């Protein structure tokens, strides 16, 4: 869920 | 405990610009987002921008692209805004935040006066 | 970006009282997420992918929804709930939150 939310503001 | 400690209440003239800042501590700097979020008086958040420590990205809210400057330095866990062409739309609480999976630590605030 | 439209704007609440309050989004969400702002003080974290609790949030908190439309409750009010709650969405970019609701406590 980190990952996926890191993606989303790159 | 994870804590953001936010520079003071700070006044600014019309048309000038402002540095805000936000130190860190109890994580690892270089391994989450942080963020700055705007509160004015009486109204909701509004998202500006935010920045990885760890490699430099940066990211904006289109709005405040070229009016809000994000940048972070991991040897002092410090993260800053830079406000530019200050007008009395921009007084307001601005809050440093982190993001793991939601926006789970945020500072206490720093009071912008836009004013002559 | 998204609109967020919370319900109601303001409302009391006894201790003990059941509350429930709204967030509508004009555009399905996968999850919405609920931050509690006491007045004077910064945001906290309060639920996160519309179901769970954040660190420290007491269990008379649940949060629940789906598509446009996410609430959440309170089972029994107490008056440390008096506060403002805000949600919050990730599906668009950028995020956004709604108003506002402010729980006051109706003594």
């Known amino acids: 869920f980190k990952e996926e939310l890191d993606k989303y503001f790159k | 405990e994870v804590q953001f400690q936010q520079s003071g209440t700070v006044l600014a003239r019309p048309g000038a610009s402002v540095k805000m800042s936000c130190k860190a501590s109890?994580?690892?700097?270089?391994?989450?987002?942080i963020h700055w979020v705007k509160q004015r008086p009486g109204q909701g958040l509004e998202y500006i921008g935010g920045?990885?420590?760890?490699?430099?990205?940066?990211t904006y809210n289109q709005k405040f692209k070229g009016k809000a400057k994000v940048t972070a330095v991991t040897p002092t866990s410090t993260a800053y805004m830079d406000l530019s062409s200050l007008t009395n739309e921009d007084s307001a609480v601005y809050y440093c935040?982190?993001?793991?999976?939601?926006?789970?630590?945020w500072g206490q605030g720093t009071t912008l006066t836009v004013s002559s | 970006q998204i609109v967020l439209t919370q319900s109601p704007a303001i409302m009391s609440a006894s201790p003990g009282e059941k509350v429930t309050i709204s967030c509508s989004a004009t555009?399905?969400?996968?999850?919405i997420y609920w931050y509690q702002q006491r007045p004077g003080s910064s945001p906290k974290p309060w639920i996160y992918?519309?179901?769970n609790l954040a660190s420290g949030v007491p269990v008379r908190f649940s949060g629940s929804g789906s598509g446009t439309s996410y609430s959440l409750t309170i089972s029994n009010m107490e008056a440390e709930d008096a506060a403002t709650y805000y949600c919050?969405?990730?599906?668009?970019?950028?995020?956004?939150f709604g108003a506002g609701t402010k729980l006051e406590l109706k003594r």
């Open positions: 992918r519309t179901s």
């Open positions: 919050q969405q990730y599906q668009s970019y950028p995020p956004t």
């Open positions: 555009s399905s969400v996968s999850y």
């Open positions: 109890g994580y690892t700097f270089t391994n989450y987002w």
């Open positions: 935040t982190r993001t793991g999976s939601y926006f789970d630590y």
């Open positions: 920045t990885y420590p760890g490699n430099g990205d940066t």
